[PDB]
Nucleic acid binder design. Structure first.
Ligand SMILES: [Zn+2]
Ligand SMILES: [Zn+2]
Length: 46
DNA sequence: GCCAACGTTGGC
DNA sequence: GCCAACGTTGGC
């Protein structure tokens, strides 16, 4: 299964894709959420 | 069936 | 070990 966003971090609370980060500009091919909405808990840990 | 957006990997 | 690209799938 896909992990669910946490719904409580600042990114999760943002409503709208910014439209200008690289995730947003390449959305059709890269299929990624806006860098500013990406759930903090879903990022890669080193 | 659509589509937002997470998971995986070839090629580097 | 990274990440562009794609496939996938849960929720609608
Ligand atoms: Zn953005
Ligand atoms: Zn979150």
């Amino acid at each position: 299964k896909k992990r669910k966003r946490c719904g409580v971090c600042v990114p999760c609370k943002r409503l709208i894709n910014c439209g200008v980060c690289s995730s947003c500009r390449n959305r059709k091919t890269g299929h990624q959420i806006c860098k500013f909405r990406k759930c903090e808990e879903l990022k890669k840990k080193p």
